[PDB]
Amino acid sequence: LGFDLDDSIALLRLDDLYIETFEVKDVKTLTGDHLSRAIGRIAGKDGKTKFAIENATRTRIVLADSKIHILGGFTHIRMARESVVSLILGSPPGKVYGNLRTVASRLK
Amino acid sequence: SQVFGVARIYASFNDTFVHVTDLSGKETIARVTGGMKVKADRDESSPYAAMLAAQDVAAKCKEVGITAVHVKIRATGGTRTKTPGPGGQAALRALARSGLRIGRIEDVTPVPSDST
Amino acid sequence: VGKNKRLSKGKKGQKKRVVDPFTRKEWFDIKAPSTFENRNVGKTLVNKSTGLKSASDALKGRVVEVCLADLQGSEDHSFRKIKLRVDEVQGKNLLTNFHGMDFTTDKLRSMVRKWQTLIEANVTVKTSDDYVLRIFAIAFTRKQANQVKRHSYAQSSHIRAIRKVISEILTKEVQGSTLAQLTSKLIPEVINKEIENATKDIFPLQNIHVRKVKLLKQPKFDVGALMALHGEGSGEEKGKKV
Amino acid sequence: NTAIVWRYKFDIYAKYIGHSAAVTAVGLPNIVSKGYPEFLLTASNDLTIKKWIIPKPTASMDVQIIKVSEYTINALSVSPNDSIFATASYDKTCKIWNLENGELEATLANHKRGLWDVSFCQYLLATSSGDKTVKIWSSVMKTLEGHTNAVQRCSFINKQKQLISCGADGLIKCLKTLDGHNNRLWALSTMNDGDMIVSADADGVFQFWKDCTEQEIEEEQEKAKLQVEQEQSLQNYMSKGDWTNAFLLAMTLDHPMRLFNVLKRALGESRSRQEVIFNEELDQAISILNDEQL
RNA sequence: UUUGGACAAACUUGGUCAUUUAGAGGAACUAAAUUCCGUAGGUGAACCUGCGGAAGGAUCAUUAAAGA
RNA sequence: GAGGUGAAAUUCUUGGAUUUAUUGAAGACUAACUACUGCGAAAGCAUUUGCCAAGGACGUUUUCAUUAAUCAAGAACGUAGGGAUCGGGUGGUGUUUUUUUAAU
C-alpha cells in the first residue's frame, strides 16, 4: 500500500497498530489546481510538514496523488487525521505547528 | 466437511457492525454492534469494541454450527470515505484469530459514479 | 451501551425476552447446475417446515453469491463470483440455476491504471430461450511492444469501431446459444479470447473481460427443464410403521 | 388488547376489552368500603384513558362502559380521596382528571423532557421525568430534587419525604442514596409507606430494604452517652488516684496529656514505694492490651 | 311535586397548633492553623447559511521490466 | 440499540430503528480512465447509439480574382535553439497484422 518495509515490520510486530485510509476528494471537492496546492501543502517543503506530523503524533503516513494512508495506534490515527483534515481545509502551518505542540503535550 | 457463513463486516463511522449470515443473505445470525459491548458512547467505534464484538459473534456462530466465514468488508459508501476504517481490520483480526476458518476477503463498499 | 448513558424513552417498551430461533431453523444444502463441477456449494437456514407460510415457498426466491474458484477448484479465476438463484426445492436439496455474474471489485480496480484507455460495452440481448441479458464487456488498451511513447491512447474513432465490433460479436455469441450454453462458454473465458482475436486487427487491446451478466426477464419455471439441467429424481416411499 | 382484574390461590375475575393494546397503567381506589371496588381507571396507547366499573361478585363480566374523555400514556395514579387522579406522561403533560366527568382540571407543564411517573400519598403530588429531577405539586411548583440521570419512579414516604429510583440507585429525600443495583429499575413498593420495607428490582436482582435502622440514632446517642461517662470517670480517677483504670480510659480515649500525667504519677509512686517497674496492676494492665492502641 | 327527614364536599368568623420565614437589632456561649467579490438570506456591523470564483497557500517516497 | 460529536444532546427505535437480502419507483450526476491531453468566439464542454446541421487542420497541377484589415453606432451569445505530445499528409521497412466478403 505504500509504507516502507520497516514500517510494515512495525505493523507486523506489536499487533495493535491499524492502518486508516481516506481521500482528498471527500472534503471541499478539490479541483485539480487546488489538489496540487493540497498535496504540496501537506508535504510542505522537502517532506518537512509530513515528517513533523510523523514525529509528533507517533504514527507514520504515506500519501498518493489523491488518497492518503496513516498507520499507527487508533487515537493517534484520529489525531493525525484531524490535523491533516485541518491542513487540507487550509490553515497556516505555524498554527498547525502550535496545534501539534499541544497534541504532543497531550502525548507526553 | 465445513459450512460457510458470510461476515458482512461494516466498518462504519462512530460504530462497527458484524453479523454473519448464511450465504443467501436472508437469515442473519447474531447481529452485534460496537455499541452493545463497550459502555462509554465515545468509543463505540473502538477497535477493542469491534474485537470483543467479533469474539462474541464467533462464539454464537460456532454454537449454531457454521465453521468457515466468507468475509466481506463494507465501508459506509456513498459520497463518503469509501474505504474501510480501523474497525474493519480489528474485527477481521479478531474473528480470524478466534478459531474460525476464513474465506475470500473482499470489498463491497458502494461506488457512486458521481452522485451528489 | 451501559448504565450511565440514558433511558431514552425506547427501553420502557418491554423486551419480549427469548424465542431461541436456531432450535427451530432448518438446514438445506444447495445443488448448483451441472455445467460446473462441485455442485454442492454449502448450506442455508430457512425456517421450520410447517404450514402457513411454508418452507418450500418462503424459499425459492433467494440468490447465493458463490465464488468461481469455490465452484471450479482452480485458482486461475479467484475473481468473477457468480449469483445462483435458488429456484426449485426438491427433497432437502435446493436445485438452483444461473442468475448473474460479477467481478470482485479489487480485480478491476487493480486492472485500471492511468496512461491507458478502457472501453466499455453493454447490450440487451435475448438468448435462444426467453432470458434477456444486459451483458457487459470491459476492454483495455495494450501498450504495444517496441513502443516508445507513454500514451497508448485510442483515437476515439477507433473506440466506436471497437465498441461496434464487440457488441456485434457478443450479441452473436449470446443469440446463438441458450443460457446453460452461455454459462458453459463463459466459464472457460473464451469470448474474451474471441474478442481479442477478432479485434486485434484494429488495436492491440490488453486484457478483455465481460465482468457482468444481468438477467432482466425470465421465461417461466419449466420444472422438467430445471431437473434436466441437473439430473432426474423421483421422490418415493418411506416406511409408515404405524 | 386487554386489562383484567384478579380477585380470589388466585383466579381470573373480570376481563376488560376495547383499546389499542392497553400497554399502560391501571388504577384502583384506595377507599373501598363494600366487598368489591368500583373504579378501574386504565390508560391506553390510543392516547386516551378509560374509566369503568368492576361489578358485583359471582360472575365473569367482560364489559366496557364509561367514557374516554381524555388526552384523545403511562403513570396513572389514584387518590385516597378519589376526587382527583393523575395521568402525567408523554413530553411534559402533567394532567390530573376527576374520576367523574373528566375535565382538563389544572394541567401542568413546567418540565423539560418526557415524564416517567407520578405518585401522591394517602397522608401533595410528586412527579418524575426525564429532567433527572423530581418535582412536587400541590397548584404550582413546590420543590424539586435532582440527581444523575432519568428518575423513573418516585413515591412519598409517609408525609413529606419521597424516595426515587433508577439513576443507578434508590435514593431517598438531599440525603442517603442506596446503591446496591447495577442496571435499570422499574420497581418501588412499600408496606405502610413509612415502615420497614421497600422493595426494588433491577433487570435481575431483588433488593429488599428493611427500614428498621432508625434505632441507629438511638445507639449513637448511647455511644455519646458512653463517651461522656467514661470520659468523666477519667477525671474522677485522676482526682482520686487508682491510676490503673485511669490509664485504661486514657488509652481508650487517646488523651495524651492526661496519659502523660497518669503514668508520671504512677512512675513517681513506683520510685517512692520500697519484675516490677510500675505498680503491678498497671504493669499487667499494659501487658494485656492488643495491638492497635499499642 | 321531595309525605316529612339525621346527614352532607366547599365556605364565614374567631380561636388552637405548627411550618418556614425574610432581614433587623439586642446579648450569651462554644468553636476558629486563511483572505475577498457578485448573486440570495437573515444576525447590530462584522461574522455566518448555500453557490460560482483568484490563491497573493510552501510537492516528500512510488514509477516499464517478469524468466516460473 | 441506532444516530450524531471534541464530549454530549435533539431525533428514531419491540407498531422491530441501524444492518442484511430480493425487488420496484423517482429525480439529479456521469466514480476510476483524467494527462500540464481534446474541442468551442467566450462562458464552458466528459455514459452509449442514432439523427440534424455546423466547424477546424491537412490534402489539392480545382474555382473566383483584391473580395483584405481596423474599430465608434448597432447586433448575437453569456532575441534564438531543442525535446515531447495531439490532428493531418509523404516516404522507409520489421513486428503486430493476415488470406477472394467489404473496409484500410
Q: How many CB atoms lie within 10 A of CB C26?
A: 12
Q: Which chain A residue has the Cα nearest residue B42?
A: A75
Q: How was this structure determined?
A: cryo-EM
- Please give the resolution of this entry in Å, rounded to 1 decimal: 6.0
Domains along the sequence of chain B with CATH: 1-116 (3.30.420.80)
The length of chain A is 108
Pair D130, C9: CB distance under 8 Å:
yes
What is the SS3 assignment for D274?
coil
Question: Inter-chain contact B3–C43, Cβ cutoff 8 Å?
Answer: yes
Q: For residues A71 and C228, give the distance between their C-alpha atoms in angstroms, rounded to a whole number.
A: 55
Question: Inter-chain contact B81–A22, Cβ cutoff 8 Å?
Answer: yes
As beta bridge partners, residue B20 has B29
Pair D37, D26: CB distance under 8 Å:
no
Residues 10-39/C with CB < 7 A to strand F: 10-11, 13-16
What is the SS3 assignment for D287?
helix
Most distant CA pair in chain A: distance in Å?
40
The H helix count followed by the E strand count for chain A is: 5, 3
Q: For residues D285 and C11, give the distance between their C-alpha atoms in angstroms, rounded to a whole number.
A: 66
Alpha carbon of C165 to those of C183, C190, D224: distances in Å?
A: 22, 16, 107
Whether residue C206 is contained in a domain is answered as: yes
Q: At what angle do helices D243-252 and D256-272 cross, to 10 degrees?
A: 160
Report, in ranges, which bases of strand F sit under 7 Å from a protein C-beta: 1-16, 18-23, 27-35, 47-50, 84-88, 94-98, 103
Tell the residue number behind the cell numbers 519484675, with chain if given: D275
Whether residue C4 is contained in a domain is answered as: no
DSSP label at residue D218: H
Residues 58-97/A with CB < 7 A to strand E: 62-65, 86, 89-95
Provide the sign of the torsion angle of the four alpha carbons A45, A50, A55, A56, taken in this order: positive
Pair D45, D52: CB distance under 8 Å:
no
Range of the domain at C136: 23-231
DSSP label at residue D213: -
What is the SS3 assignment for D102?
coil
Tell the residue number behind the cell numbers 429510583, with chain if given: D165
DSSP label at residue D34: S
Which has the closest alpha carbon to C203: C164, C169, C152, C150?
Answer: C152
Pair B4, C30: CB distance under 8 Å:
no
DSSP label at residue D160: T
Which has the closest alpha carbon to B18: B70, B78, B105, B92?
Answer: B92
Whether residue C2 is contained in a domain is answered as: no
Please name the helix (run of DSSP H) or strand (run of DSSP E) that holds residue A56, with its range, or none: helix A48-56
Chain B hits for C3, CB-CB cut-off 8 Å, are: 39
Pair C95, C87: CB distance under 8 Å:
yes
Q: For residues C141 and C68, give the distance between their C-alpha atoms in angstroms, rounded to a whole number.
A: 26
Q: For residues C223 and C89, give the distance between their C-alpha atoms in angstroms, rounded to a whole number.
A: 10
Whether residue C8 is contained in a domain is answered as: no
Pair B101, C99: CB distance under 8 Å:
no
Chain A hits for B80, CB-CB cut-off 8 Å, are: 26
Q: How many CB atoms lie within 10 A of CB D37?
A: 16
Question: Inter-chain contact B39–C106, Cβ cutoff 8 Å?
Answer: no
Q: Which residues, in sequence order, are CB contacts of B87 under 8 Å at separation 6+?
A: B11, B12, B16, B34, B45, B46, B47, B49, B50
Which has the closest alpha carbon to D171: D193, D159, D153?
Answer: D153
The Å distance, CA of D232 to C1' of E29, is: 21
Alpha carbon of C107 to those of A23, A35, C79, D196: distances in Å?
A: 20, 27, 7, 74
* Displacement of CA C233 from its chain's centroid (Å): 26
D28 is written with which cell numbers?
384502583
Chain B hits for C104, CB-CB cut-off 8 Å, are: 106-107
Pair D74, D87: CB distance under 8 Å:
no
Whether residue C28 is contained in a domain is answered as: yes
Whether residue C237 is contained in a domain is answered as: no
D56 is written with which cell numbers?
358485583
DSSP label at residue A94: H
What is the SS3 assignment for A99?
helix
Q: Confirm or reject contact between C63 and chain B (CB < 8 A).
A: yes
D261 is written with which cell numbers?
500525667
DSSP label at residue D173: -
Alpha carbon of D280 to those of A37, D54, D248, D256, D290: distances in Å?
A: 97, 85, 14, 22, 18
**Facing B86 at nearest CB: one of A23, A26, A74:** A74
- What number of CA atoms fall less than 13 Å from residue D9's CA on the CB side? 0
Q: For residues D71 and D49, give the distance between their C-alpha atoms in angstroms, rounded to a whole number.
A: 8
Q: Are strands C27-31 and C93-102 parallel, antiparallel or unpaired?
A: parallel
**Long-range CB pairs of C8-13, under 8 A, 24+ apart, other chains included:** C9/D114, C9/D130, C11/D184, C12/D74, C12/D186, C13/D23
Q: State the total domains in chain C.
A: 1
D43 is written with which cell numbers?
390508560
Provide the sign of the torsion angle of the four alpha carbons A82, A85, A86, A87, taken in this order: positive
**Facing B107 at nearest CB: one of C22, C65, C105:** C105
Whether residue C13 is contained in a domain is answered as: no
Q: For residues B46 and D97, give the distance between their C-alpha atoms in angstroms, rounded to a whole number.
A: 50
First to last CA, chain A: 30
Chain C hits for B111, CB-CB cut-off 8 Å, are: 105
Whether residue C116 is contained in a domain is answered as: yes
Residues 240-259/D with CB < 7 A to strand F: none
D79: burial class by Cβ within 10 Å (0-12, 13-18, 19+)? buried
What is the SS3 assignment for D289?
coil
DSSP annotation string for chain C: --SSS--TTTSSS-------GGGT--EEEEE--TTSS--EEEEEE-----SSS-HHHHSSS-EEEE-HHHHHS-GGGSS-EEEEEEEEEETTEEEEEEEEEE--HHHHHHH--SSS-EEEEEEEEE-SSS-EEEEEEEEE----TT---S-----SSSHHHHHHHHHHHHHHHHHTS-HHHHHHHHTTTHHHHHHHHHHTTT---EEEE--EEEEEE-----HHHHHHTT------------
Question: Inter-chain contact C7–D183, Cβ cutoff 8 Å?
Answer: no
